[PDB]
């Protein structure tokens, strides 16, 4: 599906927070909050070169 792995509002936190620069989910009190988002290496992300 062309939607898979891109239904998130994640933004990279930037350097200076002792964490990588991969985009991350916002908010609180969920458990998904602060995870990896779009990336191809990220759980629940998007696959490399989605099959067309």
């Amino acid at each position: 599906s062309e939607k898979a792995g891109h239904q998130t509002s994640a933004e990279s936190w930037g350097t200076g927070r002792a964490v990588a620069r991969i985009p991350r989910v916002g908010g609180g009190g969920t458990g998904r909050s602060g995870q990896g988002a779009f990336g191809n290496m990220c759980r629940g992300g998007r696959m490399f070169a989605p099959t067309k």
């Binding site: 200076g16 927070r17 002792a18 609180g28 009190g29 969920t30 458990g31 909050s33 602060g34």
Partner: peptide, 17 residues
């Protein structure tokens, strides 16, 4: 769950110049 934030910021002084 545990929300997190920018730990300290500032209070690091300045260096050389």
């Amino acid at each position: 769950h545990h929300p997190r934030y920018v730990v300290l910021a500032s209070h690091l002084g300045r260096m050389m110049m």
